[PDB]
């Protein structure tokens, strides 16, 4: 019953507008909650326009009949979060929630990835398996490509790579796993993980003990 956009993006210091639409808003009012990862929701606007004490003054709310709006002025990186609007149904029997709006704050400074590459553990080799682990951290923007090499030949099979995900310091992290047989691992002189980010490359190499 309550409609909000799934995403909104703004640059640092700009103003973000998040709207919520629903026929019950005039009579049942709207309430706005902020939710950060691994945290419970936090009420940021009470009854359309009231700001709770303890909420920064840059949060404000407005009402426009079947629509209510959360406005965040001078948006900061710390405001990146999910925002939920909430009302009640027309019979005042049940609460209603919007789907949530993810607010993304752009303009973060470019950052090159750090790469760590681990060879197979002795325990894993004894299990007749081999996994190489390439860990990529602290980069921005959140797009990277990973290329594996056996000696100097490309390896495409057996590669599993995550989609980059934002860390608690607002930079991105990703990981890539290469599965090999122990025979493959011992046959070649080395294996490499090549990580490309904004046209620049970092390469790590490991070799059998």
């Amino acid at each position: 019953e309550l409609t909000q956009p799934p995403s909104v993006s703004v640059s640092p210091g700009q103003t973000a507008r998040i709207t919520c639409s629903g026929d019950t808003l005039p009579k049942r009012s709207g309430y706005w909650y902020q939710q950060k990862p691994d945290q419970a929701p936090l009420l940021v606007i009470n009854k359309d326009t009231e700001r709770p004490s303890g909420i920064p003054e840059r949060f404000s709310g407005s009402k426009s009949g079947t629509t209510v709006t959360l406005t965040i002025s001078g948006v900061q990186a710390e405001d990146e979060a999910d925002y939920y609007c909430q009302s009640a149904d027309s019979s005042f029997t049940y609460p209603s929630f919007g789907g949530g709006t993810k607010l993304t704050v752009l303009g973060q400074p470019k950052a090159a990835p750090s790469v760590t590459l681990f060879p197979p553990s002795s325990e894993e080799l004894q299990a007749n398996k081999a996994t190489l682990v390439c860990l990529i951290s602290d980069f921005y923007p959140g797009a990277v490509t990973v290329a594996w090499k056996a000696d100097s030949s490309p390896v495409k099979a057996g590669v599993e790579t995550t989609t980059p995900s934002k860390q608690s310091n607002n930079k991105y992290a990703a990981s890539s796993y290469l599965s090999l047989t122990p025979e493959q691992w011992k046959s070649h002189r080395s294996y490499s993980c090549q990580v490309t980010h904004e046209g620049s490359t970092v390469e790590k190499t490991v070799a059998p003990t």
Binding site: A40, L43, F97, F118, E124, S175
Partner: protein, 215 residues
């Protein structure tokens, strides 16, 4: 101030009953507020389950209403949720919450910290492998390979080591199994002298391992 805290089993078998309790501290269950349960499947939105008044009157989400029991116990200053005949759709973080209810409107003014409850059907225990590590810093870690379902928790040295710890998001492999790695960045000088143990817990398969990571 009033504080709310959920407790109860984090794992439920399919068709079993989820059971959670909210302990209210710093105030009385008896008050003008209503008490409620809200859940949030990983990566999804909020869904209200139901509410209870201190006298016992209840009101539930009609889409769940046949499977929901919400009760109050003033002697213990707690309220509880039972959700019967669970399926995978019921895996979520469950929050207890306090509602402020007026004649024509209501909202949520206080939340517990949330507790994940996972309905576990198929499961697979991971293998846990050390990632062994001159000057400068050194990286060492633990690989938690091929588990299902999520999640796994990783800590280091029983939680005494937090600085430099980076537990990476899990990868969903083409096999439909998860893997993840956790890495600690430590001074190379502390290697020969400091012991590093990764504490892995995959509760759905009761895989609880403390793995020593040595050169």
């Amino acid at each position: 101030q009033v504080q709310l805290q959920e407790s109860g089993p984090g794992l439920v078998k399919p068709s079993g009953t989820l059971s959670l309790t909210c302990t209210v501290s710093g105030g009385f269950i008896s008050s003008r507020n209503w008490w409620s349960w809200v859940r949030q499947p990983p990566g999804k939105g909020l869904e209200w389950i139901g509410e209870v008044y201190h006298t016992g009157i209840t009101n539930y989400n009609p889409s769940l209403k046949s499977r929901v029991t919400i009760s109050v116990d003033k002697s213990k200053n707690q309220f509880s949720l039972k959700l019967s005949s669970v399926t995978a759709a019921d895996t979520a973080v469950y929050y207890c919450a306090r509602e402020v209810v007026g004649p024509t409107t209501g909202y949520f003014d206080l939340w517990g910290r949330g507790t994940l409850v996972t309905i576990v059907s198929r499961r697979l225990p991971p293998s846990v492998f050390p990632l062994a590590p001159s000057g400068g810093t050194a990286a060492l870690g633990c690989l938690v390979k091929d588990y299902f379902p999520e999640p796994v928790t990783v800590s280091w040295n029983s939680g005494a080591l937090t600085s430099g710890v980076h537990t990476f998001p899990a990868v969903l492999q083409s096999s439909g199994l998860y893997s993840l790695s956790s890495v600690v960045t430590v001074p190379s000088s502390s290697l020969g002298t400091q012991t590093y143990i990764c504490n892995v817990n995959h509760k759905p398969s009761n895989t609880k391992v403390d793995k020593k990571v040595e050169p």
